[PDB]
Design a protein around this ligand. Structure first.
Ligand SMILES: [Cl-]
Ligand SMILES: [Cl-]
Ligand SMILES: [Cl-]
Ligand SMILES: [Cl-]
Ligand SMILES: [Cl-]
Ligand SMILES: [Cl-]
Ligand SMILES: [Cl-]
Ligand SMILES: [Cl-]
Ligand SMILES: [K+]
Ligand SMILES: [K+]
Ligand SMILES: [K+]
Ligand SMILES: [K+]
Lengths: 296, 296, 296, 296
């Protein structure tokens, strides 16, 4: 009942137009672009989607648009997480109305919450999701929430939880989670260690860089299944050459810029306070777009 | 032109009613209660005000109500900070319309921003504030933003910045900031070290616990000015006996509960995912309210 | 000229007798036991060897004994690192006299040193090593020294450096190091992610748990070379079931206890302040020893 | 029975000669220099004394020399801490033989030890100290040991513990320790917040910078007792102008250089891997020595 959640799913970017409003035409084209990459699903309204610089109604708008393009074609996961439980429940109710296959919520952040408060937060969102499963987070680096292994085990046991988005570079814990939960849908969250995270126990992944090169991550899955160790390592090397550049330039805006040079997004801007890409990086980003298109 | 910003200012709590909606009647009463405590100002819509579980229109509503009660009576500082620059600018424009004396913005969080992106964020908010000064943050513990001393010096030099809210327990840096900026309005942000923070260079403070015992913090200011070292230490001891209990019970909800037992707030709830206060703590919180009222 | 350094090498434990003195007979037997496991080398006098609760003359004694047993049979690496450069140089000169194939030194710790001070420390030790190569450390978790990628690149370029002991769970950095240094001897230092660390770029490893189950780590190397992804994952699962227990009981003393039940060490004690193993864990540790012996 | 431990005590530096050997003549002169500054005691063989780049016999030599110069004149505290319990016990037995008034030991570091292992370590050292009290540490920044308040309370309750060296900038915890232990000898360990640490509850201090300007820290004690808030703040400002420079140049070697320009130490070197002072800083350090001598 949760096996359709396993796989490689881009964490969708939210295109903005030149005035910082949602670019709905480019959003639809980005959804179709990821579908045509052969991905298993899309993860909508996550941090990568710039959820935390959007209002609730803006996030609902994005969810509804993506469901219009993708429902029944690929798996649809709606990240509904806010700090507020009531805000998260509103987005989860919307994702249900729009036909999403699952919801997800980051551990609520900024304020210190007890573990039981985290559990009650997820329980409330699951209830509002009205029958579609929940993807929990581990995320300690961006959220500041540093969960134990025993707490993870209680989260993935919550009624209605169908998967864990493991946004951690700790592949000892990845292996421990897999060993304790042999059937759990377990997403690798750090793109730069994808091959090693799969080997440590993840059976899929959610990642921002999948928007520009999903076939490489799909190829790593395939190489490891095939027994082609060297091919997995070679593909990860090429992914990380790209991630190196994205870190230098700014990850979300570098991804959006590459997509603009691939004719997917009309405008590659992030919302303030993200600055635009520096002019000195445009040549490398355009060359990267050319290289990735040629590689297909 | 910024001397009216110096002093002891509660970080206002936002009262909610039994359904998690803003309790406007109790908000007005809390403002009047803090005024009658002899405070120098109020800091509205900060983290203590549960800003990050409120919408923009809810935050504007609170700002407007507090200005109605307090303008011309005490200094009014509006915390307008969001992750989004455009959202922060909307709140700053509103604070200006409502007659606030200053705006403030937490360093934008969750996503990694460069220092120049932080500066441009503050510059944009200052522009939207349309002539009232800006209070910058240091805050590294809740926001995850860990700023250098040289960066602080450039922030407090930004045109339009009139003060620094130093939410740090590093009193070496407090002293270095004071030594580099002898005229800077410098708020102590950690209530539990207020006396020591003043001694290290702060000339005032913004704090959540001032809502229930401002006269103690005003008395510490006075004791240090008078030369009564022992009185400052005794008052801080009593403050920290209270802070100990607030940490045990949950700080915002413990403060709101004490205020409810002082007949200031009708309903002491925080928004989810904050749980209600555990029943086992109610006796101690009611006894604390009684003790504080007797002390006046 | 450094290819003989590549491979799987136990970080040797130092056996102590019942009075906390070095147990020289059990040390010799442990060396022969690791040789008979088919390992490529042994790493002597590391943290795992309890170097930092031993005097210099005790560490030299251990080095000399191990060289007597192992020289010409397996690769010999001497960890000579102390906080003091002069102490480290004494141990490096000794390792040279005893016929070691390489020296190694942890980044000097406790006191903050600049990166150039680290480099000069390694240069001095390399000089005293009088022609045998140096294995540098990354280690940030135990030493508190948190090095950048650019600094690593200058360390592995120091004249006389032949390898890097990457004691980090960051497999993005592991991959970046490999991509920047395709020929570098690169040891995985976290046993619990060995398979994933090899996949990320390590071409061998140095580990404390190799003393009781080296054939599993050798088998992971082989499985990845063969293309047997599932076998690598299965072996790592079994390693981590063991590491889980070792963490619960105390790693060094649990390893020594298992070796005592394998008839390798006469006495399984660590030096104070390590406590002895709790009685409640002895059954599990004896069962583990039985299982590992049966597995051969 | 522990009141003689309260006060202002320099953490003694260990002078080395030009070849990195202990400079015994300059050590004796430094002891007499600190005595003539009016200090209450000296703390010997601490981290500031470069204990962790010295052998046990070198540390014993220093202890014995300092007792020869200081016993019966000022309080003598011997830092005997090593990672090894047995090494620490040897130094504690020596300190007893030499007539020290107390011993001290840093929380054992590098390897993770349980809290009970820490307690047993202190108990063993107290026993070897044979009747002189023990000064415990909190130190989390250099040692990596991050102790809770409840654990501190059990440490200062250990039979034979007479004081706590609070090497932390957390002045909430300082105040909590004082409130829980109104009679405890409580040393401020961060020189750069001395005035604020006294105000928060410390009743003395142990510090490296006291070697060059003890009269300023004694004057802060006096100013706070007198009620001269501004004088305490002014003296701390001047201390921190000095600490700023010492951080820029390297603290131990900057202190030793100042002492050399005061004609106290013949040679201002630290042991490798500490580099010598850069030539560009010598003018500032000589001017500082001149200023401090004039100030007396
Ligand atoms: Cl399209
Ligand atoms: Cl609706
Ligand atoms: Cl009222
Ligand atoms: Cl308007
Ligand atoms: Cl044998
Ligand atoms: Cl010799
Ligand atoms: Cl003399
Ligand atoms: Cl003796
Ligand atoms: K990242
Ligand atoms: K707090
Ligand atoms: K470990
Ligand atoms: K320091």
């Amino acid at each position: 009942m949760v096996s359709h959640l396993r796989g490689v799913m881009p964490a969708l970017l939210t295109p903005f137009d030149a005035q910082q409003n949602i670019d709905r035409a480019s959003l639809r084209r980005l959804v179709r672009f990821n579908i045509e990459q052969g991905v298993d699903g899309v993860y909508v309204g996550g941090s990568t989607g710039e959820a935390f610089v959007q209002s609730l109604s803006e996030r609902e708008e994005v969810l509804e648009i993506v469901a219009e393009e993708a429902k029944g074609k690929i798996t649809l996961i709606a990240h509904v997480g806010c700090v507020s439980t009531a805000e998260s429940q509103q987005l989860a109710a919307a994702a249900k109305r729009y036909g999403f296959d699952a919801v997800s919520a980051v551990t609520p952040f900024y304020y210190p919450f007890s573990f039981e408060e985290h559990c009650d937060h997820y329980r409330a969102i699951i209830d509002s999701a009205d029958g579609i499963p929940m993807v929990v987070y581990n995320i300690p680096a961006l959220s500041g929430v540093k969960l134990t292994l025993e707490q993870i085990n209680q989260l993935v046991t919550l009624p209605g939880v169908g998967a864990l988005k493991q946004t951690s570079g700790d592949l000892y814990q990845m292996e421990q989670i897999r060993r304790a939960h042999p059937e759990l849908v377990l997403y690798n969250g750090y793109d730069e260690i994808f091959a090693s995270g799969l080997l440590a126990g993840a059976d899929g992944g959610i990642g921002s860089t999948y928007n520009i090169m999903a076939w490489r991550y799909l190829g790593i899955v395939q190489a490891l299944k095939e027994g082609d160790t060297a091919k997995a390592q070679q593909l990860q090397h090429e992914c990380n050459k790209v991630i190196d550049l994205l870190v230098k330039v700014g990850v979300f805006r570098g991804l959006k810029t590459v997509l603009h040079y691939m004719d997917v997004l009309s405008v590659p801007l992030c919302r303030k306070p993200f600055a635009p890409v520096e002019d000195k990086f445009q040549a490398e980003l355009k060359a990267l777009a050319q290289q990735l298109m040629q590689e297909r």
